[PDB]
Design an enzyme around this catalytic site. Structure first.
Site, PDB file in Angstrom:
ATOM      1  N   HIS A  41      49.472  41.860  51.180  1.00  0.00           N
ATOM      2  CA  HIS A  41      49.517  40.560  50.511  1.00  0.00           C
ATOM      3  C   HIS A  41      50.916  40.195  50.011  1.00  0.00           C
ATOM      4  O   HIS A  41      51.080  39.120  49.423  1.00  0.00           O
ATOM      5  CB  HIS A  41      48.480  40.482  49.377  1.00  0.00           C
ATOM      6  CG  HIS A  41      48.823  41.261  48.142  1.00  0.00           C
ATOM      7  ND1 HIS A  41      48.122  42.384  47.754  1.00  0.00           N
ATOM      8  CD2 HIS A  41      49.745  41.043  47.173  1.00  0.00           C
ATOM      9  CE1 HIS A  41      48.616  42.842  46.615  1.00  0.00           C
ATOM     10  NE2 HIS A  41      49.607  42.048  46.243  1.00  0.00           N
ATOM     11  N   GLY A 137      53.436  43.447  38.778  1.00  0.00           N
ATOM     12  CA  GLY A 137      54.536  44.103  39.453  1.00  0.00           C
ATOM     13  C   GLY A 137      54.243  45.519  39.894  1.00  0.00           C
ATOM     14  O   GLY A 137      55.079  46.125  40.580  1.00  0.00           O
ATOM     15  N   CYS A 139      51.745  46.518  41.857  1.00  0.00           N
ATOM     16  CA  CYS A 139      51.024  46.667  43.115  1.00  0.00           C
ATOM     17  C   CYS A 139      51.951  47.370  44.125  1.00  0.00           C
ATOM     18  O   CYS A 139      53.170  47.183  44.127  1.00  0.00           O
ATOM     19  CB  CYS A 139      50.497  45.293  43.567  1.00  0.00           C
ATOM     20  SG  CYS A 139      49.117  44.913  42.411  1.00  0.00           S
TER      21      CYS A 139
HETATM   22  N1  LIG Z   1      47.453  45.922  38.219  1.00  0.00           N
HETATM   23  C1  LIG Z   1      47.712  44.887  37.783  1.00  0.00           C
HETATM   24  C2  LIG Z   1      48.050  43.541  37.237  1.00  0.00           C
HETATM   25  C3  LIG Z   1      47.639  43.185  35.952  1.00  0.00           C
HETATM   26  C4  LIG Z   1      47.952  41.921  35.459  1.00  0.00           C
HETATM   27  C5  LIG Z   1      48.678  41.035  36.255  1.00  0.00           C
HETATM   28  C6  LIG Z   1      49.085  41.404  37.538  1.00  0.00           C
HETATM   29  C7  LIG Z   1      48.763  42.661  38.042  1.00  0.00           C
HETATM   30  C8  LIG Z   1      49.207  43.084  39.427  1.00  0.00           C
HETATM   31  C9  LIG Z   1      48.986  42.028  40.486  1.00  0.00           C
HETATM   32  N2  LIG Z   1      49.509  42.461  41.794  1.00  0.00           N
HETATM   33  C10 LIG Z   1      47.523  41.669  40.513  1.00  0.00           C
HETATM   34  O1  LIG Z   1      46.649  42.543  40.476  1.00  0.00           O
HETATM   35  N3  LIG Z   1      47.188  40.375  40.555  1.00  0.00           N
HETATM   36  C11 LIG Z   1      45.794  39.974  40.548  1.00  0.00           C
HETATM   37  C12 LIG Z   1      45.591  38.805  41.477  1.00  0.00           C
HETATM   38  C13 LIG Z   1      45.530  39.267  42.907  1.00  0.00           C
HETATM   39  C14 LIG Z   1      46.690  39.294  43.670  1.00  0.00           C
HETATM   40  C15 LIG Z   1      46.638  39.717  44.993  1.00  0.00           C
HETATM   41  C16 LIG Z   1      45.426  40.115  45.556  1.00  0.00           C
HETATM   42 CL1  LIG Z   1      45.357  40.639  47.206  1.00  0.00          CL
HETATM   43  C17 LIG Z   1      44.266  40.085  44.800  1.00  0.00           C
HETATM   44  C18 LIG Z   1      44.320  39.665  43.476  1.00  0.00           C
HETATM   45 CL2  LIG Z   1      42.861  39.641  42.556  1.00  0.00          CL
HETATM   46  C19 LIG Z   1      45.429  39.508  39.162  1.00  0.00           C
HETATM   47  O2  LIG Z   1      46.154  38.699  38.575  1.00  0.00           O
HETATM   48  N4  LIG Z   1      44.320  39.959  38.578  1.00  0.00           N
HETATM   49  C20 LIG Z   1      43.908  39.503  37.246  1.00  0.00           C
HETATM   50  C21 LIG Z   1      44.463  40.392  36.165  1.00  0.00           C
HETATM   51  C22 LIG Z   1      43.887  39.985  34.838  1.00  0.00           C
HETATM   52  O3  LIG Z   1      43.968  38.814  34.457  1.00  0.00           O
HETATM   53  N5  LIG Z   1      43.293  40.898  34.074  1.00  0.00           N
HETATM   54  C23 LIG Z   1      42.721  40.538  32.780  1.00  0.00           C
HETATM   55  C24 LIG Z   1      41.541  41.430  32.532  1.00  0.00           C
HETATM   56  C25 LIG Z   1      41.273  41.555  31.064  1.00  0.00           C
HETATM   57  C26 LIG Z   1      40.148  42.522  30.852  1.00  0.00           C
HETATM   58  N6  LIG Z   1      39.389  42.112  29.674  1.00  0.00           N
HETATM   59  C27 LIG Z   1      39.843  42.847  28.499  1.00  0.00           C
HETATM   60  C28 LIG Z   1      38.626  42.886  27.572  1.00  0.00           C
HETATM   61  C29 LIG Z   1      37.413  42.621  28.472  1.00  0.00           C
HETATM   62  C30 LIG Z   1      37.969  42.374  29.877  1.00  0.00           C
HETATM   63  C31 LIG Z   1      42.402  39.479  37.187  1.00  0.00           C
HETATM   64  C32 LIG Z   1      41.886  38.447  38.143  1.00  0.00           C
HETATM   65  C33 LIG Z   1      41.696  37.139  37.712  1.00  0.00           C
HETATM   66  C34 LIG Z   1      41.218  36.181  38.599  1.00  0.00           C
HETATM   67  C35 LIG Z   1      40.933  36.524  39.915  1.00  0.00           C
HETATM   68  F1  LIG Z   1      40.472  35.589  40.771  1.00  0.00           F
HETATM   69  C36 LIG Z   1      41.122  37.829  40.349  1.00  0.00           C
HETATM   70  C37 LIG Z   1      41.595  38.786  39.460  1.00  0.00           C
END
Ligand SMILES: N#Cc1ccccc1C[C@@H](N)C(=O)N[C@H](Cc1ccc(Cl)cc1Cl)C(=O)N[C@H](CC(=O)NCCCCN1CCCC1)Cc1ccc(F)cc1
Ligand SMILES: N#Cc1ccccc1C[C@@H](N)C(=O)N[C@H](Cc1ccc(Cl)cc1Cl)C(=O)N[C@H](CC(=O)NCCCCN1CCCC1)Cc1ccc(F)cc1
EC number: 3.4.19.12
Lengths: 298, 298
Positions: A41, A137, A139
């Site tokens: 990705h 960052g 990933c």
């Molecule tokens: N590692 C990591 C990482 C972490 C943060 C930013 C970026 C990265 C790396 C970064 N590379 C990364 O993963 N980015 C993903 C988005 C993404 C990018 C490429 C692909 Cl192919 C697939 C996906 Cl999906 C990402 O932004 N996930 C967020 C992260 C998020 O907000 N956590 C909050 C949870 C809180 C949990 N709460 C706490 C209390 C209760 C629950 C959750 C999410 C939201 C909407 C979606 F549609 C899908 C996924």
């Protein structure tokens, strides 16, 4: 004495971490011989085959330290991008790519911009996520085990799910679990506790000199699993009993005897006591992890 | 998201570990430039000055991998032996020797026969021991922190006490705590919980998205410390309040507001709940460790 979550020394993997940039997307890659492996990705509901055919080698910027590596070829294998570079990594360790089973553990080298930041132990959960510690960052960071200076890479990090747990692939790009690499909200299946690991950890506690949770009872495998189901524990198989054989022999505590202890702990709690410094039952140590770290004599 | 006990990447220290043998005693040493540092009890109620004057350079066998290093000089500094070798270590990192305060954390590279086996995080306890994981042969293993590729070595392991906790020196050979390097049963002072670290860990939990333990109350510093004394917590100083300033600003929770939460947790327990996956209050994360690992936005 003592018992800690213990990672493998990370130096052999540190020498392989690089930065991969395409457009405004930057993540980590793994440089082994003359190939860099990273999440596909980086080239971004996408059609990856259509997106990759529009790419040129010069669209990929690979940086190892402050040195730029020239990409001379590219291909996609499942969800991993493979970038052929003009230079073989002189620090490539002896290595293998392995796809692990749920319940197995590995060390994670968390990296940002191709630079390692920390190391910690993870288990692959029964629902094929890991409870990692990752920020934006990260990933492309990898998980690994080491045996006699051979690095077995088993995980490449691809995404954080909405619940805050983590999903990724083996190093051939196949996801663990049902997940796909697109930015959509995906849910993992319900998780369970890794029973054979909890038992291994109880043996670790006995080896370290703690016995308060033992009892004079035994259980049948079938009766134990009825309690296991009730507390969302994975069923214990005869294969699990067999793999605990060495720890059972070292401590003199039959596996089904330790199961009776676990049953009592599940039904009554710890009543204010701790085991190996924990007030809950720990399930991210495999039997192998215990043998590796604890004394060979009780 | 997530929060794990996270070690520093160990590769810069892995390249410095060697084996030191004298007679039938073998332990680990640290090879930096053309000097090897190791516990002086490798030469063994001893009189070390008398024992060392009877030694020759050729009595010391230093092995780095499968290569023997020639010792060309030796001296003793407090409880560490320094062996001058004829070869400078080509993998010497940028480094410093630092003596840490109780409550500070560091990564331990556990080594056996000069070969690194695992890495884990430790805190220096208020009673100047560490709760490590060490077996026979581990003495000479070192503890360190890393900042911008400079390794600050702060611990060299010397002995396991009868209680199973661990004692050692700074890299200039001065013990932490009142201990001495002789094989006698020595006892540490009574330990206490590192209050400022528990507060930092509660802020980590808020940053990660957990708020269940907060309340609408505040406390004075003096009234909090009366509760602290009752539960064997270290007194919280105004300096501790100041160092928590950045985490307080990021979360919007005043330090004395978080103290009121900790007071309630101490007086009532968790009532079956967990914080960052723990059923007890964790005190081996410094404020710096939290800022290092958690997101800079809540
Ligand atoms: N590692 C990591 C990482 C972490 C943060 C930013 C970026 C990265 C790396 C970064 N590379 C990364 O993963 N980015 C993903 C988005 C993404 C990018 C490429 C692909 Cl192919 C697939 C996906 Cl999906 C990402 O932004 N996930 C967020 C992260 C998020 O907000 N956590 C909050 C949870 C809180 C949990 N709460 C706490 C209390 C209760 C629950 C959750 C999410 C939201 C909407 C979606 F549609 C899908 C996924
Ligand atoms: N690391 C390490 C390590 C660990 C084992 C062997 C060897 C080493 C490295 C090894 N280098 C090491 O440390 N050796 C020391 C002996 C020693 C050597 C050089 C010096 Cl200068 C000082 C000392 Cl002192 C050692 O043998 N300690 C034992 C270790 C021990 O039995 N733990 C059992 C506790 C069980 C705890 N129980 C469990 C339940 C309740 C309590 C406790 C002890 C006993 C008698 C004494 F007089 C002093 C100390």
């Amino acid at each position: 004495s003592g018992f800690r979550k213990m990672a493998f020394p990370s130096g052999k993997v540190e020498g392989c971490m690089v930065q991969v940039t395409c457009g405004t997307t930057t993540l980590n890659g793994l440089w082994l011989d003359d190939v860099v492996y990273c999440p596909r990705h980086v080239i971004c509901n996408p059609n990856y085959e259509d997106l990759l055919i529009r790419k040129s080698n010069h669209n990929f910027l690979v940086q190892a330290g402050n040195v730029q590596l020239r990409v001379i070829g590219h291909s996609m294998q499942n969800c991993v991008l493979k970038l052929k570079v003009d230079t073989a990594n002189p620090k490539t360790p002896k290595y293998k790519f392995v796809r692990i089973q749920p319940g197995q553990t590995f060390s994670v080298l968390a990296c940002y911009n191709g630079s390692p930041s920390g190391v910690y132990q993870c288990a692959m959960r029964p629902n094929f996520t890991i409870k990692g510690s990752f920020l934006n960052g990260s990933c492309g960071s990898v998980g690994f085990n080491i045996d006699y200076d051979c690095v077995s890479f088993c995980y490449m990090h691809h995404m954080e799910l909405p619940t805050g747990v983590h999903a990724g692939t083996d190093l051939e790009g196949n996801f663990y679990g049902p997940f796909v690499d697109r930015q959509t909200a995906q849910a993992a299946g319900t998780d369970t506790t890794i029973t054979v690991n909890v038992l291994a950890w109880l043996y670790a506690a006995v080896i370290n000199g703690d016995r308060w949770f033992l009892n004079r009872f035994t259980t049948t495998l079938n009766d134990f699993n009825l309690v296991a189901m009730k507390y969302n524990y994975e069923p214990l198989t005869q294969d699990h009993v067999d793999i605990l054989g060495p720890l059972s022999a070292q401590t003199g505590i039959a596996v089904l005897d330790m199961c009776a202890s676990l049953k009592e702990l599940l039904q009554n709690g710890m009543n204010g006591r701790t085991i190996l410094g924990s007030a809950l039952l720990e399930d991210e140590f495999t039997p192998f992890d215990v043998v590796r770290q604890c004394s060979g004599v009780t």
